[PDB]
């Protein structure tokens, strides 16, 4: 189990990540790049190290969001890979890969890469 | 110096990479995604480890191509990062990052990621 992961996280763009960390190492929740906007809400699932080293190392984790809900389908999926770092300034530092479904000829532009930092405090 | 890097390399898409490895660790040459087509030819510069380990490890290297020549300007640049592996089946395995100039709002789609494998034999 990883105590301080469960809860609401905000990236620097305004997006909200709401997650529950299961004792089993399961991450379950929703991602919304808007303010309680249902059309901007998507389901996420992931995994985290439920028994991290005690030496001050961070807690490795990862999650995926397929960009399809009841209002839209962007034919793409993003995976965030990173680690949770506890403390008064808790944060989840990540790197992401956004892949779009493409034809074979267009596969060269299928994957974008970037990074996000989530904190527990509003934007 | 790294003996077998200088020469003509081909990726699996048909692109041609012509490079000269300087004794100083300098990589200089041209990249053309076409057949001797001048409008498809771009200048490249990079660096490589000129005194690699002898234990069978590969030779680390990297190069950049800004996509602007006398016929076109795609307002973007690609960096390839990888290593040279000698032998009868010489090859340069790489991972690349293609960044396009964007406005601040469009920065999320600025960088694409992919990979290429170059061999000395035609496609």
């Amino acid at each position: 189990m990883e105590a301080g992961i469960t809860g609401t996280w905000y990236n620097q763009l305004g997006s909200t990540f709401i997650v529950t960390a299961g004792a089993d190492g399961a991450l379950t929740g929703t991602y919304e790049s808007a303010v309680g906007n249902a059309e901007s809400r998507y389901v996420l699932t992931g995994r985290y190290d439920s028994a991290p080293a005690t030496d001050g190392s961070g807690t490795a984790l990862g999650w995926t969001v397929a960009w399809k809900n009841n209002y839209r389908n962007a034919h793409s999926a993003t995976t965030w890979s990173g680690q949770y770092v506890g403390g008064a300034e808790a944060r989840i530092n990540t790197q992401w890969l956004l892949t779009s479904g493409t034809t074979e000829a267009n596969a060269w532009k299928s994957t974008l890469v970037g990074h996000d930092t989530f904190t527990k405090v509003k934007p | 110096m790294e003996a077998g890097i200088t020469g003509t390399w081909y990726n699996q898409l048909g692109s041609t990479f012509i490079v000269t490895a300087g004794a100083d660790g300098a990589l200089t040459g041209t990249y053309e995604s076409a057949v001797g087509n001048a409008e498809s030819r771009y200048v490249l510069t990079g660096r490589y480890d000129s005194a690699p380990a002898t234990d069978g490890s590969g030779t680390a290297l990297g190069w950049t191509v800004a996509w602007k020549n006398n016929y076109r300007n795609a307002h973007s640049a690609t960096t390839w990062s990888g290593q040279y592996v000698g032998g009868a089946e010489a090859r340069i395995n790489t991972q690349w990052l293609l960044t396009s100039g964007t406005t601040e709002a469009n920065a999320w789609k600025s960088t694409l990621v992919g990979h290429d494998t170059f061999t000395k034999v035609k496609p």
């Binding site: 997006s15 790049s33 901007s40 960009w67 962007a74 793409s76 956004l98 | -």
Partner: peptide, 9 residues
């Protein structure tokens, strides 16, 4: 081009 939903699109 169009705002992807990940970025408030």
């Amino acid at each position: 081009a169009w705002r992807h939903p990940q970025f408030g699109g």
